[PDB]
């Protein structure tokens, strides 16, 4: 269903759920997710996310298909996100 993004690593701090969809920087902000703040993400079965360093779904990126306690180079550097349903 949804992925849950956290402000700090190891699933700590402020958290927000994101169902499938495309989210620009402004759309993330409207959902209470400040720019370049995500540090960890939970990804349950059936969904995946593509985190982008730039708004508009562009730039360096990372595809998460399972829980990620940390994001390496994209830590506090995500500006847009696409959450995608992967049925099985
Ligand atoms: Ca953070
Ligand atoms: Ca960014």
UniProtKB/Swiss-Prot annotation:
Domain of life, per lineage: Bacteria
According to the UniProt record, where is the region Connecting peptide? 86-88
Per the database record, which ranges form the Beta/gamma crystallin 'Greek key' domain? 1-45, 47-85
Q: Where does Ca(2+) 2 bind?
A: 36, 53, 77, 79
Residues given in the record as Ca(2+) 1 binding sites: 7, 37, 39, 76
Record's function text = Protein S, induced in large amounts during fruiting body formation, assembles on the surface of myxospores in the presence of calcium ions.
Q: Could you say which protein family the record assigns here?
A: Belongs to the beta/gamma-crystallin family.
Kindly provide the name given to this protein in its UniProt entry: Development-specific protein S
């Amino acid at each position: 269903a949804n992925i849950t993004v956290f402000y700090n690593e190891d699933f700590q701090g402020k958290q927000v759920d994101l169902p499938p969809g495309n989210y620009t920087r402004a759309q993330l902000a409207a959902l209470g997710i400040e720019n370049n703040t995500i540090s960890s993400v939970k990804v349950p079965p059936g969904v995946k996310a593509i985190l982008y360093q730039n708004d508009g779904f562009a730039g360096d990126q990372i595809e998460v298909v399972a829980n990620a306690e940390e994001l390496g180079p994209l830590n506090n550097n995500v500006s847009s996100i696409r959450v995608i349903s992967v049925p099985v």
